[PDB]
Design an enzyme around this catalytic site. Structure first.
Site, short mmCIF file in Angstrom:
data_model
loop_
_atom_site.label_atom_id
_atom_site.label_comp_id
_atom_site.label_asym_id
_atom_site.label_seq_id
_atom_site.Cartn_x
_atom_site.Cartn_y
_atom_site.Cartn_z
N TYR A 25 -1.81 -5.76 -2.19
CA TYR A 25 -0.83 -6.19 -3.19
C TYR A 25 0.56 -6.02 -2.68
CZ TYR A 25 2.66 -5.93 -6.69
OH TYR A 25 3.91 -5.88 -7.45
N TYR A 57 -2.37 -12.31 -5.62
CA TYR A 57 -1.62 -11.55 -5.08
C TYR A 57 -0.62 -12.35 -4.18
CZ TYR A 57 -4.50 -7.35 -5.86
OH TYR A 57 -5.09 -6.23 -6.30
N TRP A 88 -9.53 -13.03 -11.95
CA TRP A 88 -8.46 -12.61 -12.84
C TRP A 88 -8.79 -13.00 -14.30
CZ3 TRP A 88 -5.32 -9.36 -13.79
CH2 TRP A 88 -4.28 -9.32 -14.76
N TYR A 131 -0.05 -14.77 -15.83
CA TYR A 131 0.47 -13.92 -17.12
C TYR A 131 0.92 -14.90 -18.22
CZ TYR A 131 0.59 -10.63 -13.13
OH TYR A 131 0.30 -9.94 -12.09
N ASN A 169 -11.02 -1.72 -13.70
CA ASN A 169 -10.51 -1.40 -14.61
C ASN A 169 -11.64 -1.35 -15.79
OD1 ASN A 169 -7.80 -1.00 -13.93
ND2 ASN A 169 -8.07 -2.85 -13.31
N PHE A 274 2.15 -2.18 4.54
CA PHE A 274 2.42 -3.11 5.50
C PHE A 274 3.48 -2.80 6.68
CE2 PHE A 274 0.08 -5.69 2.77
CZ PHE A 274 0.60 -6.86 2.56
N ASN A 275 3.35 -1.50 6.93
CA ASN A 275 4.24 -0.71 7.79
C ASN A 275 3.19 -0.30 8.91
OD1 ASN A 275 5.07 2.09 9.28
ND2 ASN A 275 6.87 0.77 8.59
N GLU A 277 3.42 1.59 11.39
CA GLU A 277 2.81 3.28 11.75
C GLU A 277 2.19 3.91 10.62
OE1 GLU A 277 3.12 5.02 14.53
OE2 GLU A 277 4.03 3.00 15.12
N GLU A 281 -1.11 5.63 10.43
CA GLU A 281 -1.32 7.04 9.80
C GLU A 281 -2.55 7.20 8.97
OE1 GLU A 281 1.32 9.26 6.52
OE2 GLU A 281 2.18 8.53 8.35
#
Ligand SMILES: NC(=O)c1ccc[n+]([C@@H]2O[C@H](COP(=O)([O-])OP(=O)(O)OC[C@H]3O[C@@H](n4cnc5c(N)ncnc54)[C@H](OP(=O)(O)O)[C@@H]3O)[C@@H](O)[C@H]2O)c1
Length: 325
Positions: A25, A57, A88, A131, A169, A274-275, A277, A281
């Site tokens: 997402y 998404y 959905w 929506y 859900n 979306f990083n 590093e 990690e």
């Protein structure tokens, strides 16, 4: 025992799922094109073999780009990769289920998905708008019929378009409607719910274990804290004093402790980053473990407060969060 090279856990249908996945997402209006594709490639390179996505998404084509590029470079085989897609609310009408999945296969340019799940137990009016509300801001619902929707899901599995079927859900009552369905062909193997130390899901987790359902923890790092969806009245999970002191014991961050916590109890985690590093990690959670005392310490952080309450849909007859669990 779980390793970076080997960390799949069994699903009740004979399939298996990598216990960590990359969440995808990201707020469309604020996210650059390509960020998802890059992130999925980085993830696969890092050792992830599971990616969690959704047509709504708006970046499911990027996931496919990433997966197909890494296959083409012989980094992995299709069989090595687990993709979870979602049906959905606007697509719960039985005759729309298969066409909806086929749309996602086109988007992905793939022949099947590994896991296809009902995204919410609430049915919304069919249409392009994800929506739907009218001119007076009223939500345009549809009458849910979880059993008839599940039957259409089963047919997609029989047609070879998906390996495993699940839900998201769902509360216990909604799981039981499917589990008790006459003529049930494929039991749900997975329930994807919010789960982290501030919302540990004790009762739902135990119920699912009793029925051989694996829980997948969405927002396992406590979400991106987007005020459109998030209960920001709750404090930021990753700033928790205790989690950060626990991280110091192992030279790990709060995030790494939080992910290890859930995988250590057989809960799948799908942290989004979306990083570069942080993608790495997040994956470094196989070179340490939490003691039994530390597992109890972290369980005790449970506040029973959700960050993702979906309050805008509280009036839907199948709104999942009024029940205790
Ligand atoms: N089925 C459903 O109803 C449902 C609902 C919500 C979410 N999900 C799925 O679950 C995935 C995960 O949840 P989520 O995206 O809500 O949240 P999340 O994974 O709990 O965390 C998201 C936030 O954490 C940041 N972050 C990532 N790694 C971090 C690290 N090591 N240290 C500090 N910050 C870190 C991310 O920023 P950066 O990207 O900049 O690192 C992002 O802002 C979603 O992406 C989606 O695939 C499913």
């Amino acid at each position: 025992d779980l390793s970076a090279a080997s960390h799949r856990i069994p699903l009740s249908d004979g399939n298996s799922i990598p216990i960590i996945g990359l969440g995808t997402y990201s707020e469309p209006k604020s996210t650059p094109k390509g960020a998802c594709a890059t992130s999925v490639k980085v993830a696969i390179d890092t050792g992830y073999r599971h990616i969690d996505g959704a047509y709504i998404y708006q970046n499911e084509h990027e996931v496919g780009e990433a997966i197909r590029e890494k296959i083409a470079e012989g980094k992995v085989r299709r069989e090595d990769i687990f993709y979870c897609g979602k049906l959905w609310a606007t697509n719960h009408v039985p005759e729309m289920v298969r066409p909806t999945l086929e749309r996602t296969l086109r988007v992905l340019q793939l022949d099947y998905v590994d896991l296809y799940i009902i995204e919410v137990p609430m049915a919304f009016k069919p249409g392009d708008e994800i929506y739907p509300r009218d001119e007076n801001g009223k939500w345009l619902y549809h009458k849910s019929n979880l059993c008839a929707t599940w039957e259409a899901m089963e047919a997609c599995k029989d047609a070879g378009l998906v390996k495993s079927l699940g839900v998201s859900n769902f509360n216990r009552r909604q799981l039981e409607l499917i589990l008790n369905k006459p003529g049930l062909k494929h039991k749900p193997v997975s329930n994807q719910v919010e789960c982290h130390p501030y919302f540990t899901q004790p009762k739902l987790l135990k119920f699912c274990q009793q029925h051989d359902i694996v829980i997948t923890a969405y927002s396992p790092l406590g979400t991106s804290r987007n005020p459109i969806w998030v209960n920001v009245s709750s404090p930021p999970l990753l700033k928790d004093a205790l989690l950060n002191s626990l991280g110091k014991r192992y030279n790990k961050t709060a995030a790494q402790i939080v992910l290890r916590f859930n995988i250590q109890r057989g809960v799948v985690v799908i942290p989004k980053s979306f990083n570069l590093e942080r993608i790495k990690e997040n994956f470094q959670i196989f070179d340490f473990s939490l003691t039994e005392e530390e597992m109890k310490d972290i369980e005790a952080l449970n506040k029973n407060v959700r960050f993702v309450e979906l309050l805008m849909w509280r009036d839907h007859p199948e709104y999942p969060f009024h029940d205790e669990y």
